[PDB]
């Protein structure tokens, strides 16, 4: 599923991401834009053999099981396929664990490089929340 901007903002809010660990909704929408272009089915293979999955490009090295990342963990206790669903519940739950892990949203490289310190409220402007 490819979400629209305001449609994703609403879905994230419903699932309790707005202001989670102090990050406003705009940060989450911004990170989703540049990680996946709002596509729940997005996947990307890394040079180390791990794969990033879903709307927030959650990585198999630590967070989910895909059966093909040797020596990896599955700290969200889910198959990586669950992160590709049209329903974003699994991705949001895992993102909450990730952002609590110590480095905040810096865990998302695209957020650090393209969202951090910018006018992220622009991403929720005009949206009926």
Swiss-Prot record:
Could you state one GO cellular component term attached to this entry? endoplasmic reticulum
List positions binding substrate.
Answer: 101
Q: Name one Pfam family in it.
A: Lys
Q: Which UniProt keywords apply?
A: Allergen, Antimicrobial, Bacteriolytic enzyme, Disulfide bond, Glycosidase, Hydrolase, Secreted, Signal
Indicate the enzyme's highest-level EC class.
Answer: hydrolase
Q: Which PROSITE patterns match?
A: GLYCOSYL_HYDROL_F22_1, GLYCOSYL_HYDROL_F22_2
Do you know which InterPro entries this protein is assigned to? Glyco_hydro_22 (IPR001916), Glyco_hydro_22_CS (IPR019799), Glyco_hydro_22_lys (IPR000974), Lysozyme-like_dom_sf (IPR023346)
Q: Which reaction does it catalyse?
A: Hydrolysis of (1->4)-beta-linkages between N-acetylmuramic acid and N-acetyl-D-glucosamine residues in a peptidoglycan and between N-acetyl-D-glucosamine residues in chitodextrins
User: Which stretches make up the C-type lysozyme domain?
Assistant: 1-129
Q: Where is the active site?
A: 35, 52
Q: What is its EC number?
A: 3.2.1.17
Q: In which tissues is it expressed?
A: In the egg white and polymorphonuclear leukocytes.
All disulfide bonds of the chain are 6-127, 30-115, 64-80, 76-94
An example GO BP is: killing of cells of another organism
Annotated compartments: Secreted
GO terms of molecular function: beta-N-acetylglucosaminidase activity; identical protein binding; lysozyme activity
What family name appears in the similarity comment?
A: Belongs to the glycosyl hydrolase 22 family.
Q: What else is known?
A: Lysozyme C is capable of both hydrolysis and transglycosylation; it also shows a slight esterase activity. It acts rapidly on both peptide-substituted and unsubstituted peptidoglycan, and slowly on chitin oligosaccharides.
The role this protein plays is: Lysozymes have primarily a bacteriolytic function; those in tissues and body fluids are associated with the monocyte-macrophage system and enhance the activity of immunoagents. Has bacteriolytic activity against M.luteus.
Describe its assembly: Monomer.
Name of the protein described by the UniProt record: Lysozyme C
Q: What high-level taxonomic lineage is stated for the organism?
A: Eukaryota, Metazoa, Chordata, Craniata, Vertebrata
């Amino acid at each position: 599923k490819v979400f629209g901007r305001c449609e994703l903002a609403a879905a994230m809010k419903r699932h309790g991401l707005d202001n989670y660990r102090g990050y406003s909704l705009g940060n989450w929408v911004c990170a989703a834009k540049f990680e996946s272009n709002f596509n729940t089915q997005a996947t990307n293979r890394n040079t180390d053999g791990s794969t990033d999955y879903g709307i927030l490009q959650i990585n198999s090295r630590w967070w989910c099981n895909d059966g093909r990342t040797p020596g990896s963990r599955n700290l969200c206790n889910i198959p990586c396929s669950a992160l590709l669903s049209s329903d974003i519940t699994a991705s949001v739950n895992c993102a909450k664990k990730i952002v609590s892990d110590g480095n905040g949203m810096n865990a998302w490289v695209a957020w650090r490089n393209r969202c951090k310190g910018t006018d992220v409220q622009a991403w929720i402007r005009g949206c009926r929340l």
